[PDB]
Amino acid sequence: GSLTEDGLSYKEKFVVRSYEVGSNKTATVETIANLLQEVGCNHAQSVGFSATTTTMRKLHLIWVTARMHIEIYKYPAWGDVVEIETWCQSEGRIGTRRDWILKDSVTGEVTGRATSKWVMMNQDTRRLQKVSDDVRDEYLVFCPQEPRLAFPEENNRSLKKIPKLEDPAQYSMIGLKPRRADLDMNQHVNNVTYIGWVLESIPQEIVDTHELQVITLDYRRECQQDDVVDSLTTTTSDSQFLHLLRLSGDGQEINRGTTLWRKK
Amino acid sequence: GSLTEDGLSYKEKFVVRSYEVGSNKTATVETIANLLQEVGCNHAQSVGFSATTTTMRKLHLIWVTARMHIEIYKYPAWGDVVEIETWCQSEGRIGTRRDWILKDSVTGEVTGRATSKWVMMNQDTRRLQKVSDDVRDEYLVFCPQEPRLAFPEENNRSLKKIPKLEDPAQYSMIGLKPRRADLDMNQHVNNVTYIGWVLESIPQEIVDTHELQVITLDYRRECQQDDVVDSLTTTTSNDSQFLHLLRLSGDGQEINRGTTLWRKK
Ligand SMILES: NC(=O)c1cnn(CCO)c1
Numbered sequence: 001g002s003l004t005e006d007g008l009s010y011k012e013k014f015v016v017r018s019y020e021v022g023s024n025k026t027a028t029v030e031t032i033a034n035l036l037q038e039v040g041c042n043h044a045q046s047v048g049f050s051a052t053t054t055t056m057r058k059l060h061l062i063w064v065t066a067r068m069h070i071e072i073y074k075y076p077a078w079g080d081v082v083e084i085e086t087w088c089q090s091e092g093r094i095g096t097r098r099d100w101i102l103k104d105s106v107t108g109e110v111t112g113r114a115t116s117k118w119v120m121m122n123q124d125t126r127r128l129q130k131v132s133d134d135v136r137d138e139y140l141v142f143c144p145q146e147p148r149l150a151f152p153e154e155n156n157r158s159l160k161k162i163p164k165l166e167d168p169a170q171y172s173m174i175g176l177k178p179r180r181a182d183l184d185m186n187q188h189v190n191n192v193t194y195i196g197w198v199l200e201s202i203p204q205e206i207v208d209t210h211e212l213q214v215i216t217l218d219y220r221r222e223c224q225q226d227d228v229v230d231s232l233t234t235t236t237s238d239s240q241f242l243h244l245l246r247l248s249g250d251g252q253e254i255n256r257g258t259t260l261w262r263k264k
Numbered sequence: 265g266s267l268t269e270d271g272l273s274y275k276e277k278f279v280v281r282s283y284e285v286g287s288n289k290t291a292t293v294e295t296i297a298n299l300l301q302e303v304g305c306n307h308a309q310s311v312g313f314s315a316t317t318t319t320m321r322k323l324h325l326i327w328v329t330a331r332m333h334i335e336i337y338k339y340p341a342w343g344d345v346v347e348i349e350t351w352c353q354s355e356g357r358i359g360t361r362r363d364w365i366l367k368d369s370v371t372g373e374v375t376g377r378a379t380s381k382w383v384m385m386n387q388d389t390r391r392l393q394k395v396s397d398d399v400r401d402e403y404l405v406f407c408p409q410e411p412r413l414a415f416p417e418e419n420n421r422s423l424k425k426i427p428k429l430e431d432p433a434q435y436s437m438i439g440l441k442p443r444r445a446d447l448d449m450n451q452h453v454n455n456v457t458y459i460g461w462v463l464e465s466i467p468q469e470i471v472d473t474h475e476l477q478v479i480t481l482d483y484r485r486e487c488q489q490d491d492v493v494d495s496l497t498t499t500t501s502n503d504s505q506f507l508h509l510l511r512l513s514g515d516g517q518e519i520n521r522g523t524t525l526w527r528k529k
């Protein structure tokens with residue numbers, strides 16, 4: 001892994017592992033999402049972070065994911081080498097954005113793209129806030145100044161408003177709980193686990209006959225280590241689904257999302 | 265990754281990832297176990313397998329894990345490079361064995377070792393059997409002929425008989441179920457998931473104050489995709505030892521039994 005020539009983006013190569021692939025011998029969307037997180041972490045490290053800045057540590061502020069959007073054209077096969085390029089951009093005082101481009105290292109063709117929105121939060125009170133002048137200045141020296149979008153298109157899928165699933169759900173997977181492998185180094189549930197939980201309510205027949213093309217996921221509230229989740233799905237249609245993750249007890253919303261699948 | 269000079273073992277380097285580490289910023293035992301499986305798979309591929317031999321595919325036979333034993337001296341930190349060497353050995357008609365050695369790539373020191381026992385099974389009937397002469401000869405050209413043991417010692421921990429936990433268990437974690445990420449390419453539960461399930465019944469205070477030094481796990485029966493598991497633990501003991509049992513939540517059918525040894529940080 002290394003920063004590019006201008007120092008405004010970062011690239012890394014990965015060889016797809018045996019336990020990282022599903023039934024079609026290609027990487028799962030969760031493996032892709034893990035690789036995106038890893039290259040994001042390596043980018044932050046290369047430019048002097050830890051993604052907390054000096055002003056963020058002084059004010060006890062952290063970046064939290066608000067939205068993740070992934071589009072895959074070809075999932076890499078077991079043993080294939082995939083190259084991922086990542087970069088960050090400031091979005092005024094709303095927050096920041098991290099984008100990714102996935103390419104087949106042998107053919108050089110784009111096989112996937114992703115975009116994520118991050119918001120500022122006080123790590124103690126858990127209260128969201130706007131980006132201060134001081135943080136925006138310390139982030140700009142590591143970001144491209146002109147816009148650089150993984151999803152440039154006017155009215156693309158990554159910025160669509162997602163509705164709340166109405167009961168009864170067509171499909172469901174209940175009593176989902178995180179185990180220690182689902183936690184990050186700070187004992188918080190890893191963001192990729194929520195993608196897995198959303199996908200658990202998709203029926204196996206759809207998975208066996210379709211490929212996941214697009215996934216958009218909103219993050220509303222974190223699942224704690226001792227929480228239990230219900231995963232709900234309804235067909236809205238290619239096949240499209242509307243998703244909802246909520247706490248099994250009180251029914252508190254933790255995530256909402258949509259998936260688009262293509263027939264194999 | 266590459267086979268060594270003599271072609272009787274395989275080495276591969278790994279850089280420890282951000283999502284692969286726990287609270288201490290070092291690789292979890294499950295990350296180590298995944299890396300062991302990956303280097304094992306790369307070894308099998310390099311010597312012409314896919315690890316069914318020609319005679320195994322003809323008779324619908326597969327290798328299945330009977331036991332896994334891991335000892336860690338130092339867990340590699342996030343960003344560290346670890347080198348793993350693996351090799352196989354035939355154990356007569358009982359089955360085969362795969363061994364591993366883990367080293368810090370920078371210091372060259374051994375930071376861990378592992379050994380696993382595999383038995384032959386008919387893929388369809390699920391019936392265990394002995395290794396035939398034709399299968400034994402077919403894989404001896406890929407194995408060292410003289411013994412090469414990751415655990416050589418006279419009465420070492422890797423070959424100890426494990427007893428069955430008696431109810432009531434001191435600790436328990438109930439209703440554990442596999443999700444799609446827990447399955448391998450053939451839709452079977454990955455062997456590393458069982459290690460995670462066993463560890464779920466260890467109290468968080470032990471995890472926060474101790475490091476896992478040794479884990480020995482027996483595999484009796486597989487957990488199916490629609491099965492639910494209960495994880496049970498009882499302390500048996502400076503060091504803390506536990507006895508473990510995984511069983512199906514319904515009928516109480518045994519799937520795994522094991523022991524863990526932990527040292528104070
Ligand atoms: N606490 C959370 O996990 C979280 C993630 N996004 N948000 C709201 C974004 O506007 C809250």
Ligand SMILES: NC(=O)c1cnn(CCO)c1
Pocket residue numbers: 328329330331383392483484485486
């Ligand atoms: N997963 C199984 O069916 C399995 C694993 N080990 N064994 C018995 C080995 O003596 C059976």
